[PDB]
Amino acid sequence: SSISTVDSMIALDIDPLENTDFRVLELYSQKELRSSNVFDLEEIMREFN
Amino acid sequence: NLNCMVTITTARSKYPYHFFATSTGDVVDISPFYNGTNRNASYFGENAD
Numbered sequence: 449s450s451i452s453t454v455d456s457m458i459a460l461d462i463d464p465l466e467n468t469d470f471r472v473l474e475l476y477s478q479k480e481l482r483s484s485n486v487f488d489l490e491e492i493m494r495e496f497n
Numbered sequence: 498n499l500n501c502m503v504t505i506t507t508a509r510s511k512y513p514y515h516f517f518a519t520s521t522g523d524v525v526d527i528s529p530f531y532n533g534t535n536r537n538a539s540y541f542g543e544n545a546d
């Protein structure tokens with residue numbers, strides 16, 4: 449059994465596409481969104497009260 | 498009855514920083530960084546006197 453063989457198979461191993469769990473990216477937090485104002489309504493109303 | 502007060506509040510200004518606004522609604526048209534020698538690079542529109 450040493451006479452050897454022939455590997456005639458043409459390899460076409462295509463790797464599967466890996467799974468991707470997309471992140472819920474957040475650029476500005478809610479604190480920055482509330483702090484991005486020259487005038488805040490809650491502060492004005494509290495001062496008036 | 499005469500009473501003098503000294504209130505210490507927080508004021509907010511947004512870029513380009515050409516006016517600030519205290520929490521009590523004191524809208525001031527003076528740049529918070531105008532030091533009296535950089536009027537060309539900072540706004541000032543309140544009364545001069």
Ligand SMILES: *[C@@H]1O[C@H](CO)[C@@H](O[C@@H]2O[C@H](CO)[C@@H](O[C@@H]3O[C@H](CO)[C@@H](O)[C@H](O)[C@@H]3O)[C@H](O)[C@H]2NC(C)=O)[C@H](O)[C@H]1NC(C)=O
Pocket residue numbers: 532533534535538
């Ligand atoms: C009032 O604020 C203005 C800016 O709005 C000041 O002008 C700036 O002052 C700085 C600090 O001296 C200057 O920086 C200096 O620049 C040179 C390089 O040119 C260097 O030799 C120093 O190490 C230093 O960093 C700056 O050039 C100057 N101008 C601008 C357009 O930014 C002004 O000095 C302030 N006045 C007072 C009385 O505080």
Ligand SMILES: *[C@@H]1O[C@H](CO)[C@@H](O[C@@H]2O[C@H](CO)[C@@H](O)[C@H](O)[C@H]2NC(C)=O)[C@H](O)[C@H]1NC(C)=O
Pocket residue numbers: 537538
């Ligand atoms: C005063 O500020 C203005 C703009 O804020 C400066 O005008 C700029 O001048 C530079 C250099 O001459 C130009 O490249 C810019 O295009 C100009 N910008 C504008 C909006 O005009 C002016 O030079 C400043 N004066 C000073 C520093 O004496």
